[PDB]
C-alpha cells in the first residue's frame, strides 16, 4: 500500500470492497444520475472530509 493511491471508488470499481459493494453502487448511481443541477465530484467522505488536520480548521 502507498500514500498516494487515494481510493477513487467512484472512478475505479476495483477499490470497492465486496462488503461495501451494494450501498456504494447505490451511492455512485445517485452521484451520476442525481447530478442534475447539482455537482459531479468524486467520492464524498474521502476526497472531501479527509482534509489534513492542519487545514481542518483554517477558518
Amino acid at each position: 500500500l502507498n500514500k498516494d493511491l487515494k481510493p477513487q471508488t467512484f472512478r475505479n470499481a476495483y477499490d470497492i470492497p465486496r462488503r461495501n459493494l451494494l450501498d456504494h453502487l447505490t451511492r455512485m448511481r445517485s452521484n451520476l444520475l442525481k447530478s442534475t443541477r447539482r455537482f459531479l465530484k468524486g467520492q464524498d467522505e474521502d476526497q472531501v472530509h479527509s482534509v489534513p488536520i492542519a487545514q481542518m480548521g483554517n477558518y
Partner: protein, 410 residues
C-alpha cells in the same frame, strides 16, 4: 441472440403439431378461463395444465392476451406442491412471449414476482426504474431462488436489464452532456459485479438446506446461474476479473470452476491477483488456482502453480505469526490440489510443508500450550475446539501432509 435463435427451425415438429392439434377449433381456452382456473381456492393443477399445454401450440402473436394471466397468477406457482410440468410449461410460454414483446413482459414479470409480504405496498416498477436499477429483479420472492423455471425467467430478465441499463446510462450521459465516461464505466462494472455476486450468493445453500447434493432444485439453479455467468464472462472478461478481485465465498469455487467454461481465462490475472497487498485476495487467488489446476491441467497452469508455491514460500518469511495462521489455514488444503494435478511439484510442496511445519513447531515451543504437539511426535492418523492458533496450524500441516500422501498411495 437467445431470444432470437429460439425462433429458428429445428425439424418442423412444432408446425406439424400446431396443424394437427389446433385445428379442432375448440377455442374455449380464453385468458379469462385460465384466470378462473388459477383463482380456484381448491386449485386443480390438472385443469390448469389442460389450458396452458394447449397454449404451447399457439403462435407468439396469438399468445399476447394470455400474458397478464400467466404472469400475474404465477406468484401462486411458488407455493409448495406445484408440479414441475406446470412450471416448465409456464417457462416455455414465457419464452414464447419474450420473443415477441420482451419489455412489457419483463415489467409485468418483475411486478408479479414481488415478495408480497407487505403487498399493500405493491411496488409497481416501471421500465425506467428497472433500467436504472437492474438489481430489482433479484429482490424477488425467496422461493424463486429454488424454482429453476422462475429462476430461469429471472436470469433472462437480469441479463436483459443489465444490457438495457448500459444503453440507458449511455443515453442519459449524452442527454445531460449539454470523467463522466469513466464514472459510467465504473458504475456499469460495479453493477455487473454486484449482479454476479448476488447470483453466487443465491448458489449457496441456506442454513435450512445446511441442516444428495446433486439431485435437488439447488443444483438446477446453480447450473442456470453458471450458464448466465458463462455468458457474462464471455461478453466481458473484465467482469470476471473484477468479480475475482472482489472474491466470493470459497465454497462456490469448485462449483464455478466446473460449471463455467470461461474460467480458463482466470489463469491470466491470477499472477496479478497474487501480487495484491491484501491477504484475503492472495488466499482467494491460491484457492482459485488450486481448483483451476484440478480442472485445467495445462503447462500454463503448472507455471502459475509454481509461482503460487514460490509466493507461499516467500511470504512464509514475511508474515507474522497471526498473519501466518490467517494465510495458511485456508490455503494449505489447496496444496493437496497442486500435488494431485502436478506430481513435479512434489519436491517443492513437501519442502515448503517441511519449512512451514518447522516454523510452526518453533512457534509452538515459544509458549506454553494446552496440547503441546512437540511431545506427541508419533501419533497415528488422528481422524476427526477453541485451541491455540499454533497447535491448530500444526495439526493442519499434519492433516494436509496426510491427504497428500493418501492421494499418492490410494
Amino acid at each position: 441472440v437467445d431470444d432470437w435463435i429460439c425462433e429458428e427451425e429445428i425439424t418442423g415438429t412444432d408446425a406439424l403439431l400446431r396443424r394437427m392439434l389446433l385445428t379442432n377449433n375448440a377455442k374455449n381456452h380464453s385468458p379469462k378461463q385460465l384466470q378462473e382456473a388459477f383463482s380456484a381456492v381448491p386449485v386443480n393443477n390438472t385443469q390448469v395444465m389442460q389450458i396452458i399445454e394447449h397454449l404451447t401450440l399457439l403462435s407468439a402473436s396469438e399468445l399476447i392476451p394470455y400474458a397478464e394471466v400467466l404472469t400475474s397468477n404465477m406468484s401462486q406457482l411458488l407455493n409448495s406442491g406445484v408440479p414441475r410440468r406446470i412450471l416448465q410449461t409456464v417457462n416455455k410460454l414465457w419464452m414464447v412471449l419474450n420473443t415477441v414483446m420482451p419489455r412489457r413482459l419483463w415489467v409485468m414479470t418483475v411486478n408479479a414476482l414481488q415478495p408480497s409480504i407487505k403487498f399493500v405496498r405493491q411496488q409497481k416498477y416501471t421500465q425506467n426504474d428497472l433500467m436504472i436499477d437492474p438489481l430489482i429483479v433479484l429482490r424477488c420472492d425467496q422461493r424463486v431462488h429454488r424454482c429453476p423455471p422462475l429462476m430461469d425467467i429471472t436470469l433472462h430478465m437480469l441479463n436483459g436489464y443489465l444490457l438495457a441499463s448500459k444503453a440507458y446510462l449511455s443515453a442519459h450521459l449524452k442527454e445531460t452532456e449539454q470523467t463522466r465516461e469513466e464514472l459510467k464505466n465504473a458504475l456499469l462494472a460495479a453493477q455487473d459485479s454486484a449482479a454476479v455476486q448476488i447470483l453466487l450468493e443465491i448458489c449457496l445453500p441456506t442454513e435450512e438446506e445446511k441442516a444428495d447434493n446433486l439431485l435437488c432444485n439447488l443444483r438446477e439453479v446453480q447450473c442456470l446461474i453458471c450458464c448466465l455467468l458463462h455468458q457474462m464472462y464471455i461478453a466481458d472478461p473484465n467482469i470476471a476479473k473484477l468479480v475475482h478481485f472482489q472474491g466470493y465465498p470459497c465454497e462456490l469455487l469448485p462449483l464455478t470452476v466446473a460449471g463455467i467454461p470461461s474460467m480458463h481465462i482466470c489463469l491470466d490475472f491470477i499472477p496479478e491477483l497474487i501480487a495484491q497487498p491484501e491477504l484475503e485476495k492472495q488466499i482467494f487467488a491460491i484457492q482459485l488456482l488450486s481448483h483451476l489446476c484440478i480442472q485445467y491441467a495445462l503447462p500454463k497452469s503448472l507455471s502459475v502453480a509454481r509461482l503460487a508455491v514460490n509466493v507461499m514460500g516467500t511470504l512464509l518469511t514475511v508474515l507474522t505469526q497471526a498473519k501466518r495462521y490467517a494465510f495458511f489455514m485456508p490455503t494449505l488444503p489447496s496444496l493437496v490440489s497442486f500435488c494431485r494435478a502436478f506430481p513435479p511439484l512434489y519436491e517443492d510442496i513437501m519442502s515448503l510443508l517441511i519449512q512451514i511445519g518447522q516454523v510452526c513447531a518453533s512457534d509452538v515451543a515459544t509458549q506454553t500450550r494446552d496440547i503441546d504437539p512437540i511431545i506427541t511426535r508419533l501419533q497415528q492418523i488422528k481422524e476427526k475446539g477453541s485451541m491455540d492458533p499454533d497447535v491448530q496450524l500444526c495439526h493442519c500441516i499434519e492433516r494436509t501432509v496426510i491427504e497428500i500422501i493418501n492421494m499418492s498411495v490410494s
